[PDB]
Every structure is written in structure tokens, then in C-alpha cells.
């Protein structure tokens, strides 16, 4: 519960030529710059996405929660990304049908108790349907505002 560090440049819009590896690069990059995670953090996130996919077939737009073991995280951090086109992420529950994804929540948590709590709260925010509709229109400066307000409440 050692605080989820958030900055402005931890939110960015991604172009249309991005694949699954391109996303994990762009979202991790600010986290390794600020010493949040190890140098090869994108490697360990990609490795876990191959073994445990994080595609979520939520309505109306699917999402992905790419993360890794808390062993490769120095400080708790979050990185957000919005995609211009739906990118295929494999289903997390096991259905062979993939999931189109436009919003991606890279989670960088450092200990097991924080992974279970943040992941549980994430399940509630993706069910905020009227919020899953406005995430695709807010720009990189404002997406901060709404999404950071729900981080400052977690300290409860």
C-alpha cells in the first residue's frame, strides 16, 4: 500500500500501427525512466502476456491489464494508453476468441497484497460503463484528471 505513483506523462495516446509488443514498449517507457521498474520490464510483461493473457472482453470496448510479477517493480506505478484502432489481446479467462482492445492499463505493483487490491478495484472501474465510453475521447492531459481521482480514493 506504499502509494501508487502517478505523473502526467504516464498517459499517452498510441497511433494506429501498434501491435501487442508496440503497446507494451510505449506504456512501460516512462516507468523505466523514473526508476519505477527494472530495465527489461517490457520483457517480463511480454513474457507473462504469453503465459497469462490479460484481454478483457468488457462492454463496449475490450481492455487489457498487462502486468508482471511484483519482483520486477521498485515502486508502485500505473501507465495508461489509448489505441486508435482495436488491437487483438487474447482472452484472460481462456476462450479461444481474441478481444479487440482500445484501452490498456499497464499495472506495475511491487508486492502481492497490492496486486490483489488494485486488480480487484480495476474490475469495478471497467464495469463503470459510462466511464468506458468517455475514456476514448478525453485527451492525454485530462485522462489524468478522472483516472487520478480514483487513485486518490484508494488510500482508504
Amino acid at each position: 500500500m506504499q502509494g501508487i505513483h502517478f505523473r502526467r506523462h504516464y498517459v499517452r495516446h498510441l497511433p494506429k500501427e501498434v501491435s501487442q509488443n508496440d503497446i507494451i514498449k510505449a506504456l512501460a517507457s516512462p516507468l523505466i525512466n523514473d526508476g519505477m521498474v527494472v530495465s527489461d520490464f517490457a520483457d517480463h510483461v511480454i513474457t507473462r502476456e504469453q503465459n497469462f493473457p490479460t484481454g478483457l472482453p468488457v462492454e463496449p470496448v475490450g481492455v487489457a491489464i498487462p502486468h508482471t510479477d511484483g519482483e520486477y517493480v521498485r515502486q508502485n506505478a500505473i501507465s495508461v494508453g489509448i489505441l486508435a484502432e482495436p488491437v487483438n489481446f487474447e482472452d484472460a479467462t481462456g476462450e479461444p476468441d481474441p478481444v479487440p482492445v482500445r484501452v490498456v492499463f499497464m499495472l506495475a505493483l511491487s508486492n502481492w497484497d497490492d496486486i490483489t487490491n488494485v486488480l480487484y478495484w480495476i474490475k469495478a472501474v471497467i464495469q463503470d460503463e459510462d466511464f468506458m465510453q468517455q475514456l476514448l475521447v478525453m485527451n492525454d492531459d485530462e485522462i489524468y484528471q478522472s483516472i487520478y481521482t480514483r487513485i486518490s480514493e484508494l488510500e482508504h
Partner: antibody
Amino acid sequence: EVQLVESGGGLVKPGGSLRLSCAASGFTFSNAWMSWVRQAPGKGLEWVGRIKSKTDGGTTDYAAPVKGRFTISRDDSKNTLYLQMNSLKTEDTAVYYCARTGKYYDFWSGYPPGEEYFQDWGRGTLVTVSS
Amino acid sequence: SELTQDPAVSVALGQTVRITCQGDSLRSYYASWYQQKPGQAPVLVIYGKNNRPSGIPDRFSGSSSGNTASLTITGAQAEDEADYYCSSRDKSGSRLSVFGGGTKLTVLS
């Protein structure tokens, strides 16, 4: 390939103290969680306690009948786990096992802090508390 | 304790058997299953949502319903005759672990 060896069991008078050790080989002991489970002769398994890795804060938890009396401490430098038993009672007579604890959390149907399972089990050391 | 099992269950060789574990905390957490042969240390069989370690036959499978958890052996073999224990949290919100009473499986082999 994974091996867990327990030692230190013996006869102890009621109210005495005993220390158990657990040698871990075949994995990264520094990152894995560790539990102690005991089984009285002819009875079922009973969870004693668990220590987390230094990554996850190194917290320790204990069952009600042993809280305060038993203490779990790890030593990543030599890949060994310890169980310090104080104020031993007749009820503590059991085969004590050393188990590597795994972590699990289902995203869609799980509740924090998740579930803990025991993958690899040592062979067990016998502790007898009797006058 | 919190988790309760059937003390003894017998099954014919090559048929299906269900061992049940009942507890209040099972409404919030999954249960793992452990097989203990006589004179041997326990071994993990089913954990989480039907997760099975490497080297465990595919006839072993776990499930859950309300406040109960189940271990199903499809076509029981002689090697499956042992004692079975369920493990889960003691109550909701806890970080402690609790084992079930245990079940003695008898495979009429």
C-alpha cells in the same frame, strides 16, 4: 529437483523450547513464500504459519493455537527456514512439514488477498512433547 | 474447524468419485486439494480454478459451488487410493490458512 529437508525434531518436556530448520534446494528461496504445517499422529493436517518473501514485506502469520508461542523466521543467505517453538504443550506433538507456498488470484471471481496453496512438501520432522 | 469434509468415501475401480469440502470462506476463496499416501508427505493435486501441476493425471479436476468445493476423479485408479485434504482461508478477508478434516478414499481395486 525441488528438495525440502526438515530437522530438529525430538522429545521435549512440556513448557520447553525447540527450534526446527528447513533446507530449501531447487528453486529461488529468496522469492518464494514458505509455510509450516503439522500433522499429529493419526490426525489431519493443521496449518501452523507462513512467512512471505522479502519482496512482499516478509510478513508472518500464525494459527490461533500457536500465535505468540511459535515464530517463523527465514534466512535467504543460506536458503534455510526456521521455526522457533516456545512454551511447548502436549497438543503440539506432531510431524512438522515445511512447504513452499504459492500464490493465486482469479481476476473475475477472486477476493483479496487471494488464495495460498502448497506446492512442494518436505518429508517432515517428528516433535514429541511429553513429560 | 471451518472446512468440513466427508470422513470416508469408497469407489469402484474405474468409476467416478466426488469429494466435497464445505465452509463459509469458500464463498469468497477457492480451495486447493492435497493427496497424502500412507507414510508419505502430502502432494498438491488441484489448486485455484482447476489448475493442475505437471505430473498429475488429467482425471483430477476441481470445482466450486456456493460454499462448497469439489474434487472429482474420473475413472478412479488404484494409485488414487489415499487421504485427501482441502485447504482455504478460515474466514472472508483473512490471511490465514485452514485445512479440512480430511477424506479417506477407498478404491475397491
